[PDB]
Symmetry: C3
Subunit: 282 residues, 3 copies
């Protein structure tokens, strides 16, 4: 199924007929970082499998719902169970849910992920406001926009120089200062490793040479689809480890260590994003 | 349809039966840079859609013709409307028209494109004679030759060290000096960004570190297919902008700015390539 | 055909019913470097085309057999004719033979390849023990594990930091010292160029900047599938040329020069790997 105007419109029509919520803000939350979704007010939970033209996710399994409702007085739509390109989803499958958000009225997209630290200032448990990226799949002919352009959503050749909204970064930092956790908050450049293997020790050393501050396996495809169709983005990485230190000390990483860091910062990230939602403009 | 000997032969047979021209030189022209094609003498215009085994291009639309005739007393064949890999065309679709040129008798291929400047000496409106490349899709398992080798055209493992003919670069520069525009002409290394998003500001900074002089979304696939089957190449980039300056000053790019630079240099590029065609050997 | 538990099990059942050998060690040998296979004791040769669910290889042609028997008193299984991703084989086709080795009992995988030298200490005819890698296809969304995870074999997010076993590297070097050819043996970082074009001169210069010691078109996909399912790896490159010197002197490479280097070192590599097999643990 192509992520075109007609197909996105059919999905949006279904959602509107079931939901009654017209959302202004969209959220996509990293693994272990989804507690905010279960606290959306006056919720409507819509399984992906019930929505016309949504991608099939039964091979991977696990949760996959669209959740609509209110947070801090604002109308929102959340993806509960996100689609990652290392699972084998196509460009068209990643793009369709973001384009449905656009047709529903979304103007701002908030994203979190788990990532590895490259910059030597980064510790496990730190947050990084993403200010730009290095897209190795895009340089290598696997950009999420490879294929025909869908003209109704955006231009053939997008400019990504303002993909990460500056004012939203400023608002996130201001709220951290108000609650005295600004010592955990950095800004940086995100490298997209297609995955699913963690970056090797020698790949980590290369990324340091190339000016990368953090590395992960998500987020950039969604940012590009959002920027193409005029949706503003705030993207925040939670740092699971410093891969450069681990390479120097011959120390291993694993998904269990990652999820324990997620549990340690989950409640603070929830509180932070609730206040960002309450206060952001447009 | 595979870009094999039998399929390329059927297309060449059709073209010969319609055209009567046996071309020695092939041309592929960048967007906004095609005025020379409309001035080919005693032309025959052949829509792609009429040629056996040519790739289907109706999803993208817009022009797609093969044009045969004479320029400066030489017999040529031009592609009017080129195929780019960011549109989703396969390896086999890109390669078949170049292999048809080979079977028709082409010995030299001349190529132009629009590109972004990385080297700090490059200004909007400058020309760059390409002397080598960095192929991010090829390093990343999306080389145009991935698949079975077509032995009738070339070897399994090509050497690209002389893909950009030195004497043709010398002839292009000599003609620029004769007409006193050599101050616009540079040489450099081309980075292939698969696209279709312009390189991000942080990707631009990385390319500077890695020794790239210009960046664009075309040309390298055609160069590799030509080199594989023994066709000599001259490739010239027209610089639309300096991406490193734009990153330092937080300035945007777009396809409209690119096309205005094309219009500013179109007539001079036309005159230059007409004289190159008239004078080149083999 | 997916490289899943059921499909790998059917292939293993066939092999066991024909072979009677339960191997502990697997070998994959580079082009021109396969003489050891023809000296396996009490051999059983099994054409790939006869084994349930093995990948189809008739488009490329040439040899494709699984060979089981004894070397130095150890039970082994060899791939005679390996599958390379530049031929167009999918992730699933590369992975299935390694997962069949796992089900047959393999605990150690020994690999050789031909490669280009980047580090200035490397000469034609030298050997490099691989200690880590830079996986350009993996960074670029063409990792061999992209797709659903096969949970019976390994985790969703593997750590590659110990993919190249340290003790096996130590054993290989010790045997070189015993036979007084340690002056030919180095260690280094391998860059995976998807291929099939040799790295361009300017790509070679980039790889030097990025800390790569050697570059080639194989090995990393097999290493990753082996590491995912808990098989220990030793990987050795035979250096055909120094690509950095060739770029400075404008000297060409070709498959014929590569194969002549293979012939020069074939008998010594055979003797070396026979002794490694005899002596390795686990
Ligand atoms: O604090 C507030 O809510 C405003 O003053 C504000 C809004 C914003 F989008 C960014 C800010 F840095 C600050
Ligand atoms: O000017 C001419 O036409 C020849 O002298 C010439 C031909 C060429 F291929 C390259 C040159 F630099 C010069
Ligand atoms: O020489 C032998 O066989 C053992 O002493 C040995 C075994 C090994 F796996 C690695 C070694 F460096 C040495």
């Amino acid at each position: 199924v192509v992520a075109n105007y007609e197909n996105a419109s059919m999905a949006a029509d279904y959602i509107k007929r079931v939901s009654n919520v017209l959302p202004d803000i969209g959220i996509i939350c990293g693994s272990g970082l989804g507690k905010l979704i279960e606290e959306i007010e006056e919720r409507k939970v819509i399984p992906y499998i019930n929505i016309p033209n949504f991608p099939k996710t039964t091979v991977a399994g696990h949760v996959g719902n669209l959740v609509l409702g209110s947070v801090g007085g604002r109308k929102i739509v959340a993806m509960q169970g996100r689609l990652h390109m290392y699972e084998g989803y196509s460009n068209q499958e990643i793009a369709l849910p973001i384009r449905v958000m656009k047709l529903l009225g979304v103007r701002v997209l908030l994203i979190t992920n788990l990532a590895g630290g490259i910059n030597r200032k980064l510790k496990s448990g730190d947050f990084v406001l993403i200010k730009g990226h290095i897209n190795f799949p895009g340089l290598g002919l696997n950009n999420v926009l490879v294929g025909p352009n869908q003209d109704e959503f955006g231009p053939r050749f997008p400019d990504l120089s303002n993909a990460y909204d500056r004012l939203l970064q400023q608002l996130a930092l201001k709220i951290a200062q108000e609650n005295d956790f600004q010592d955990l908050v950095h800004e940086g450049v995100y490298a997209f490793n297609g995955g699913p293997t963690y970056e090797s020790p020698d790949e980590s050393n290369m990324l340091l040479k190339l000016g990368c501050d953090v590395v992960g396996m998500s987020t950039v495809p969604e940012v590009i689809i959002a920027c193409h169709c005029g949706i503003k983005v705030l993207a925040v990485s939670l740092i699971a480890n410093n891969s450069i230190l681990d390479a120097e000390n011959d120390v291993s990483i694993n998904h269990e260590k990652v999820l324990a860091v997620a549990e340690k910062r989950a409640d603070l990230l929830q509180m932070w994003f609730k206040e960002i939602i309450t206060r952001l403009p447009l």
